[PDB]
Structure formats: structure tokens, C-alpha cells
Amino acid sequence: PCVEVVPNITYQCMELNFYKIPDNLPFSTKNLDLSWNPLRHLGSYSFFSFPELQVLDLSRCEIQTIEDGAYQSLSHLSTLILTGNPIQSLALGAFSGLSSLQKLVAVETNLASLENFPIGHLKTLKELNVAHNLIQSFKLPEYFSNLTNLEHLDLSSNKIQSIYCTDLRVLHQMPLLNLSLDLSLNPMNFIQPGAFKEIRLKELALDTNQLKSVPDGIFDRLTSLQKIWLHTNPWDCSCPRIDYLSRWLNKNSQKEQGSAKCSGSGKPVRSIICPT
Template sequence: MMGPVLAACLLIILSTAWISQANGATCKKDGGVCTCNDQTKNVDCSSKGLTAIPSNIPTDTDRLVLNYNKLRELEPTAFHGLNKLTNLDLQWNELQTLPTGVFDHLVNLDYLSLSTNELKSLPSGIFDKLTKLTDLRLSSNKLQSLPNGVFHNLPLLKELYLNDNQLERLPSGVFDKLTQLGTLYLNDNQLRSVPNGAFDYLSNIKTLWLHNNPWDCTCNDILYMAKWLKKKQDEGLGGVDTAGCEEGGKAVLEITEEEAAEDCVYPNTTTAIPTTIITTLASSNDDDIPELPVPQENFQKFLGYQEPDHLPTQPQCLMSISGYLGLMMSLVLTSAAILYVIHFLKKA
């Protein structure tokens, strides 16, 4: 009696182990969904409908391509053990957030693309361990601001793409450590000015795109940028005249101090209210203060109000070919084991 029972248990254990191995495979040759090249150490998982990073990516992988998938989030340990990775492509996914420390093990990374996702913000220190990075692409997201010092640990960075976002301002000194930067894309954002001294350390800049921003040329905040662009134009840097004023269409570098004489206050800055205004308001009757029509959307924008994010839809599940094969094999082996036990029980 013990013979068939032990045999059945052994079959079940073996089938479970096989299924576990198949479901954990990454490369097609092992039953996974990705194409792996042993010579180049490239792993290509693009256009697979993935909702999670495949497990068991070879630890010696040099280039990992995950673009054109359905990744909405990353596990904090998604890239642990991949310290030989130099190229990581995550563009054309649905990433909304990044967990703190998700890239900390990628100490040899040279290229990182997060373009064409749905990122609204970046965690502080998200790139701090990527000290060898030379190319960072964050274009075509929904970034409205950047953390202070977000690029401070990237001294070798040569290309930075921030275009096609919703950036309304830049932190002071955001580019101060990027002395090797040659390409900077800031076009197609909501920038009205840049902080004083923002470009002073870009000694190797060769390409700079600033167009399609609502540059406010009536405020004296624009004067630093106007003078810097004029100087760079005289030095032969191309593209500096692409920054145009929101009103009038005049190039920013042509703005004079007389034209930009106002002290402007934007909703995302903190400026003390002059005491004369406070005194006037305190001494005025309510009836004397005219009621000014303020569009609701402008008022909400001034207060920093944002519509709540849409409720996430039910996550899409993906079962790889190995998963289907594993499930079928499990059913076959389990059925065989049961029939085997019943057969011996009847004989007994």
C-alpha cells in the first residue's frame, strides 16, 4: 500500500518543482517570454504586455529592454542583483510612481530611459546611486516639479531629457553639478522663468531646447535667462533664440530691463505682502472692496488644487507560455498520480 502512495507524492513534488522553475524563467529558451543573447548579455522583454518585471533575469545582463509594456509600478527590489547592468529601457509603459531606492543596485548604469510614462513626481534621491549615468531620459511624463538636488550625484551626465512634461518651476541649483552636460531639453513645459544662476555651471552645453514654454518677459525674473542666452548666442551656441516670450513672440534673449521691470509673484513662490496693502485692506470696509470675477480653474490652480487621480482599474494579469504549460503539466501529472493510486487500491 505504501508503494503507490509514495510514488504519487514523488510525482506531485517533481511536477511542482518543474512548474516553479518554468514560471520563474525569463528567457525563451527556458520557457520564459524574453529574448536573451548570451554573447551580448542583452535581455529583450519589449512588447510582451508585461505588468511586472520578469523574475530570474540573468545576473550578468548588460542591457535590459522593457519598453512597450503595461508596467504601472515597480517593486522596490525589481533590479536587485543586476549590478552589471549598463542600459535600462523602461519607456512606453504606464509607470505612475517610482519606489525609493529602486535603482540603488544599478551602480554601473550608463543609460536610463523612463520616457513616455505617467510619472507625476520623483522621489528624493532616486538617482543618487547612479554615479556613472551619462544619459537620462524623463521626457513625455507628467512631472510638475523636481526634488531639490535630484541630479546632484550625476557628475558624468551628458544628456538630460525633461521635455514634454508639466514643469512649472526648477529648483535652485538643479543643474549645478552637471558640468559635463552637453544636451538639455526643457522644451514643451510650463516654465515662466528659471532660477537665478540656473545655467551657470553648464560649461559644456552644446544643445539646449527651451521652446514651447510660457516665458514671462514682463517680470524681472526673466532677466538672468535673457542675459545668459544672449551671451551664449554670441559664443555660438545654437538654439538659444528658440525661447520666445509668451506674449508678443519676442525672443527672450532680446528682452531689456525696461521691458521686464515688474516684480512678479507666482502661485508657487512665497513672497511677503507689502505692509501698505495690508494696512489698506485692514482699514477698508467690505463694501469698498470690489468683487473681482475669478475663474474657478484659475483659483484652484493658485491654491495648488489638483483633481484626484482616477481610480486605478483592475490590474491586467499576464500568464506566460511557460505558465500555461506548467498548469497543464500539473493537471496531467496530478491526474496520473490519482489514477495510479486508485489502480493499486482496487488491486488491494
């Protein structure tokens, strides 16, 4: 037994030195916290005895691998947290059976590429958090065209250096309703002209990166955009290089959260007026 938070519903099994999933818990359990347990590896049907699971926290469980069908029976699960696991191998069917998964948190799991991240069948997914990883390319794999319900994608604190036009290809031909994209805290110093064309976005975070400039009209092909973060970037406010951005930011002051500032002087980019 773990700490019973709610009878036959919620149990807290964090740090009890478990190496296997507990079998002495109600089959009606909805919430399970198994964080901080040397689980090391997950085999097929690891949670067969918990068909009612909706939220599963497995962060910091020293997990290295996950075999096909590890969560095969959990068809009611909507939140899976894998934060802090030194994952090194991820089978193709590792997330098989998660037909209701809405939130996947894979922060700090040594993720190096989205291509090999076997999540292309989680059509019900609404939130994907892969912040604090080793991803160095923002090129979205073709399977993203099946994630029609995605409204939040967090790629902050990774190794992304730039955003090419091709990177959002998949979203061009299979647009989402209200997508919020977080790309802050990346060593990003380049955005290719027309990389956000035909793209629909509700939020775009690009603060605390390495940007000095952006292509002209980069944000013209957008209207659903509501919030944007550009602060904490070494903006080059010489003219006419800063012309488009300074004007855009001034004609959209409500959208910008925080304040993009000019390197050196510290003057708001939206306050600069370039000569004609």
C-alpha cells in the same frame, strides 16, 4: 525557431505567440527580439539558457510582473528594452544579476515613482530612459549615488510639475562626469531658485513645458553645459522679469538649440533688452 538574422548570434522572435522563452535557440545568442509575445509574467531565471545575451528586447509583451532573479544569469547583457509593458508590480530583486547593464529602456511601463524602481545596483548603467510614464516628481532617490556611470537620463513626457532645490540633492554630493538630462514635454511651470547649484550638466532639455519664468542666475552654477533646450515655453518677456534669461540666452546663443520665444509677440527671448 524564430527568424535567423545571424547564425548562432541574432534571432528575431517577435510576434510568434510565445508565452514562455524559447528553449530551441543557440546558447551563444547575443541579440534576441521577443517583442509582441504574451509573456505576461517573468519568473526567476527566465533566461538561464542565454548566458551570452547582450541585447534583450521585450517591448509590448503584456508583462505585468517580474519576480526576483528574472534575469539572474544574464551577466553580459548591456541593453534591456521593456517599452510598452503594463507593469504593475516590480520585485526588489527583479533586475538582480545584470552586472553589465548599460542601457535600460522603460518607456510606457506605467512607472509612477523612481523610489520603488529597483535599479539601485546597476552601477554600470549609462542610459536610463523612462519617458512617457506617470512620474510626477523629479526628486531623485538616494540610490542614484551608486549609479556613478550614468550619462543619459530621459524623463520627458511625464507628470513633472516643477524642479525643487532638493530634487538634485543626490547629484550634488556624488557628481557625474558628463550627464545629459531630458525633462521636456512635462507640465512643468516652476523651477526653484538655486536648483542647479553645484550640479554638472552636459545637456539640459526643458523645451515644450509650461515655463513662463526661471529664477535669477539659475544657470550660473554651470560651465560644462553645452546644449540647452528652452523653446516652446510661454515665456513672459516683461521687464525686469525676463532680464536674466534674455541676457543669459544671448551670452550663450551657441548652447541654445531651437529658440525660446516671447508669448504673444513671438520675439526670441535672447533678443530682449531690459532697461537698467
